[PDB]
From a paper:
Crenezumab is a fully humanized immunoglobulin isotype G4 (IgG4) anti-Aβ monoclonal antibody designed to bind multiple forms of Aβ (monomers, oligomers, fibrils and plaques). In vitro studies demonstrated crenezumab’s ability to block Aβ aggregation, promote Aβ disaggregation of oligomers, and protect neurons from oligomer-induced cytotoxicity. Crenezumab’s IgG4 backbone confers reduced activation of FcγRs in comparison to IgG1 and was shown to minimize FcγR-mediated inflammatory activation of microglia – which has also been proposed to contribute to neurotoxicity – while preserving FcγR-mediated microglial phagocytosis of oligomers. The complementarity determining regions (CDRs) of crenezumab feature a very short H3 loop of 3 residues and a long L1 loop of 16 residues, thereby creating a deep paratope groove at the interface between VH and Vκ.
Residue numbers in the entry:
A (entry chain H), C (entry chain E): 1 to 52, 52A, 53 to 82, 82A, 82B, 82C, 83 to 95, 101 to 215
B (entry chain L): 1 to 27, 27A, 27B, 27C, 27D, 27E, 28 to 213
D (entry chain I): 1 to 27, 27A, 27B, 27C, 27D, 27E, 28 to 214
The structure:
């Protein structure tokens, strides 16, 4: 199995720096050129930097040339990206890539604002509030910054009928989203429902139970 | 750099029907060893890009036969013989013949499934949030198609505007539907001085608009 | 969006009884014949009972005829199975099905033994305990009864590289299993690893952090 | 009851290659209206059965063209033109022509992928479990193929027997490999009077048997 695992993402003040790391396994890492590709939400794939097999040839777009440095350690099967003089336009998801495979990416955001943990509120269901023939319930994950947040239902045991909406920036400059789940109306009593909310940048883990309210 | 240009950028397809994407390169992609390093990637909703076709026409591991790539020089084509629901996502053609690695703008394939009306639910703000001083009211439009829908918030039958944000999910890879949340924000004090909160949903799958609503304190 | 959600499973003493429920949504439930099908682990699909659309027509194999009763409530969109005089050979996963779709199933165990919660032990990773180029870690979920138990990693966020093994009955009559995950060697320090263990029949929920240790 | 019979019950397939399952019914399956209620179901690892083909030859919603069904009367065939990794699982033919609904014994499709050697890891018991009185030692064989493998436990070079259980996963729907846990159980006091704990793995992808081991209380 091939794995590419980025890490090091987070929030930085403008002008500040950040180092990203990528750990690879499942293929001959030394035999492969590697690259960092980034993507702002909605946008497409922008190449940030490339380095070749032995690690002796690099390329940079003018947009980051002089600022970013792609490094490599064929022994630890790792790939690095030193980001200096960070600009607000550098805000993006950064992927580690080999051509054949892409990591899941790490989130880099550049802003002059502090990190806030989310509040998590029940979107309580109801019988009498059924939409043929499902009930709906959820969790409101509000006023956090920066991205990302992780949301699961029942420690991952509940996945069918789940929708976790894309975060939206509020005029406050804080993110907010809802995660919802629909279940057949009659199954409402039969089980308990907990949303699992994780926001690493502020070290916030919440497990909110969601009940009918009566 | 070698510029990659895709056509179209939006590709609506009824499932089971074929689909074609064109990719043009600003320069020949034949490398000095005679090979052509044109590739196709697919980024499914919620996921990293994955390799679909490498070197014009080679299917990557796990890739079904319905995906076939062809072309030469500067003009290439990805064909999907029968678009399945799971094929939804954005397709990128790409060249690695010369540094830098470059990508097309990306084509977003959309499944043209049957019309489906949204299930609508309205959620009052929790008493817990009301401690904080703010009140979020949420309206859920679930598993509908097509994406275009209108949500109107009416407080005490007074149509709202300027105080609500929407969020749509990407097209579902299993049933080709969307879901939408609309979130009405207002102050606690503002919230308490009204009674009837309502959400009204217009969608092509509904004969007539649907309203869900609640009265603060019932 | 079709859903079929079974509930009511669990452990019963021989001779005792149990009621299973199935909540349906996303299709015209009244318009469909329904059945209960069971499956012992390893074994194939055994029909338990069928009911037609009305439903005023039922069938039972002789293996359960006289003991089991399949009812239907076309109003609440629900299907039921009343199981009386339960026998040890009735131990199985019971599925709710319409022919087009099957629920995830609910687990029925008929035994002369008591319910016990699991212990969860770290399977701690290390170096140079690497196997090119991955490290392995996990959780040992031991001495519980009856099935099932739920295991996830990092509240559902970590899923690739994960192997959760089929439970095995020990000679003590208690189940045991391991859940393990492999990650690229040099990504060990860069993230924390919690296994999330739930065993409903005893109300046991454990989250165990797994660390390298010295 | 109409009896359903499948051939074969074990079906090894090199991926990309085609596969065929036959299904015979003990009685004709055409119903009073002229239709034939012969269906194929698929149960992927860890999942419920799902409908693949209904009424001999109709692809269910979401089912790709590589799955085609054919046949008539009492003789039916499912063909998979190009077996993909994700196609792994157990296939059942089924009739609903007459009550009761019945099922074949099931055909388990195996993906014949290339040999893959297991990555092997050994885990000492936690200090925590050792307070309970029992010590579990665990050996992991990860992402290998084929499934046949031998695990032997050695304690102070004494070969063990009768104190270890194995668990194997189902074939992976993504990389077509298996994984295996072997778990050596013994008394705390038993565990303390020995020093060298070792796991020895033999597999077709290993030129020579591989041993991982640890010494009690070292790290």
């Amino acid at each position: 199995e091939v794995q590419l695992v980025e890490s090091g993402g987070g929030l930085v003040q403008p002008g500040g720096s950040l180092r990203l790391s990528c750990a690879a396994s499942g293929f001959t890492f030394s035999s492969y050129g590697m690259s960092w590709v980034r993507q702002a939400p909605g946008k497409g794939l922008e190449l940030v930097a490339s380095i070749n097999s032995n690690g002796g040839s690099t390329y940079y777009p003018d947009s980051v040339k002089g600022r970013f440095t792609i490094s490599r350690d064929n022994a630890k099967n790792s790939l690095y990206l030193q980001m200096n003089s960070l600009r607000a336009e550098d805000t993006a998801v950064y992927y580690c890539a080999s051509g054949d495979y892409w990591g899941q990416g790490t989130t880099v955001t550049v802003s002059s604002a502090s990190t806030k943990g989310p509040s998590v509120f029940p979107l309580a269901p109801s019988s009498k509030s059924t939409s043929g023939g499902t009930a709906a319930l959820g969790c409101l994950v509000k006023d956090y910054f920066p991205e990302p947040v992780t949301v699961s239902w029942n420690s991952g045991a509940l996945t069918s009928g789940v929708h976790t909406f894309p975060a939206v920036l509020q005029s406050s400059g804080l993110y907010s989203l809802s995660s919802v789940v629909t279940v057949p109306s009659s199954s409402l009593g039969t089980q308990t429902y907990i949303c699992n909310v994780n926001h690493k940048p502020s070290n916030t883990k919440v497990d909110k139970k969601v009940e009918p309210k009566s | 750099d070698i510029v990659m240009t895709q056509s179209p950028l939006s590709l609506p397809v009824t499932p089971g029907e074929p689909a074609s994407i064109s990719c043009r390169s600003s320069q020949s992609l034949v490398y000095s060893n005679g090979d052509t390093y044109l590739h196709w990637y697919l980024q499914k909703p919620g996921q990293s890009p994955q390799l679909l076709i490498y070197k014009v026409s080679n299917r990557f591991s796990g890739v079904p036969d319905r995906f076939s790539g062809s072309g030469s020089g500067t003009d290439f084509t990805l064909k999907i013989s029968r678009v399945e629901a799971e094929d939804v996502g954005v397709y990128y053609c790409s060249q690695s013949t010369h540094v830098p690695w470059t990508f097309g703008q990306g084509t977003k394939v959309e499944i043209k499934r049957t019309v489906a009306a949204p299930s609508v639910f309205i959620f009052p703000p929790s008493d817990e949030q009301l401690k904080s001083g703010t009140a979020s009211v949420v309206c859920l439009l679930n598993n509908f198609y097509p994406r275009e829908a209108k949500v109107q918030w009416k407080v005490d039958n007074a149509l709202q505007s300027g105080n609500s944000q929407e969020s749509v999910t990407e097209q579902d890879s299993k049933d080709s539907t969307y879901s939408l949340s609309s979130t009405l924000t207002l102050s606690k004090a503002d919230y308490e001085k009204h009674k009837v909160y309502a959400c009204e949903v217009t969608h092509q799958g509904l004969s007539s608009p649907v309203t869900k609503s609640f009265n603060r304190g019932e």
